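Hi again,

Forgot to attach this to my earlier email, sorry! This is the prediction with chloride ion bound. I've pasted everything inline since the attachment limit keeps bouncing my files.
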Amino acid sequence: KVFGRCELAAAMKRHGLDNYRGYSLGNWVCAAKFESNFNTQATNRNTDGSTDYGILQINSRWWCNDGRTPGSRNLCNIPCSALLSSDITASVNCAKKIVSDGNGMNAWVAWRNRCKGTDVQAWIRGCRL
Ligand SMILES: [Cl-]
Ligand SMILES: [Cl-]
Ligand code: NA
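Structure tokens for the complex follow:
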């Protein structure tokens, strides 16, 4: 599913990402934008052989099992394919585990490089939340 900008913000708010660990909704929306362009089916091979999955490009190196990433962990205890579902529950629930690791939203390379410090509020502008 390719989510609309406000449509995704609404799903993310309902799952409790608005200010999760101090990160305002706008940050989660911006991250999604640049990680997957709001496309739940997005998959991208990392140079280390791991793959990133879903709307928030959760890494098979540490977070979900895809059976082809040697020596990796499956910290969210899910098959990476669960992260490509039209329903973002699984991706969100896991992102909550990732953003809590101490390694805040910096674990999302695109967020660090393209959202951090910016006016992430613009990402929710005009949305009924
Ligand atoms: Cl594996
Ligand atoms: Cl933080
Ligand atoms: Na894995």
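The chain has one domain: 1-129. The first helix runs from residue 5 to 14.

That should be everything now.

G.
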